[PDB]
Amino acid sequence: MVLSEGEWQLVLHVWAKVEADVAGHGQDIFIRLFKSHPETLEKFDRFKHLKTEAEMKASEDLKKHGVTVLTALGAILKKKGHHEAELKPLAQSHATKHKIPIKYLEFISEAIIHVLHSRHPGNFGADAQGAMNKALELFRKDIAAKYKELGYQG
Ligand code: HEM
Numbered sequence: 001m002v003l004s005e006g007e008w009q010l011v012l013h014v015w016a017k018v019e020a021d022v023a024g025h026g027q028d029i030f031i032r033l034f035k036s037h038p039e040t041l042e043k044f045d046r047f048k049h050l051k052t053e054a055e056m057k058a059s060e061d062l063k064k065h066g067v068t069v070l071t072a073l074g075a076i077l078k079k080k081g082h083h084e085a086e087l088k089p090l091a092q093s094h095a096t097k098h099k100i101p102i103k104y105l106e107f108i109s110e111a112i113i114h115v116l117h118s119r120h121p122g123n124f125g126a127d128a129q130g131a132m133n134k135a136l137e138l139f140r141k142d143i144a145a146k147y148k149e150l151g152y153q154g
Pocket residue numbers: 040041043044045046065068069072073089090093094098100104105108
C-alpha cells in the first residue's frame with residue numbers, strides 16, 4: 001500500500017504536536033495499552049510487576065522507555081514509506097528477542113490512535129485519523145513481512 005503526500009502531511013502534522021511532549025505521550029500510550037490489554041504487560045520483564053496506573057505513572061524507567069519507543073516510531077513515520085533500513089533491527093529484536101505477535105502491534109496502534117484522538121481532536125479529525133491508521137497499517141504490514149523472512153510467524 002502507498003499513502004499520498006496529502007496523507008503523509010496529515011500524519012506528520014499531528015506528530016509534530018506529539019513531539020512537543022514525547023515523554024507525556026509515551027506514558028499515556030503505554031498506560032492505555034497495559035490497561036486495555038493486560039496480557040501485553042507480561043511481555044516486559046522490567047515492568048510486569050506494576051500493579052496500578054499510579055505505579056505506572058510514577059515509573060521513571062517506563063517513561064524513559066516510552067520516549068525510546070516513540071522516537072523510533074517517529075523516525076519511521078518521517079521516512080514516509082522509505083523505512084526499510086529502520087525496520088530491519090526493529091523487526092529482528094521484536095521477533096527474535098521479545099517475541100511480539102502482530103496482534104500486539106495492532107493493540108499498541110489502537111492505543112496510539114486513542115491517545116491522539118483524546119489529546120489532539122482539532123488535528124485528529126476523521127481524515128487525519130484515517131491517514132494515521134493507514135500509516136500504522138503500512139508499518140504493521142512491512143513488519144509482518146520481515147517477521148516471515150526472519151522465521152517468526154507470530
Ligand atoms: C509501535 C511499535 C513499536 C515500536 C516502534 C517499538 C520500539 C521499541 C524500541 C525502539 C525498543 C528498544 C530497542 C529494541 O529492543 O529493539 C523496544 C523494546 C521493547 N519492545 Fe517494542 N516497540 C513497539 C511495539 C512493541 C509491542 C506492542 C510490544 C509488546 C507488548 C513491545 C515489546 C518490547 C519489549 C519487551 C522491549 C524490551 C523492553 C526492555 O526490556 O527494555 N514493543 N521497542
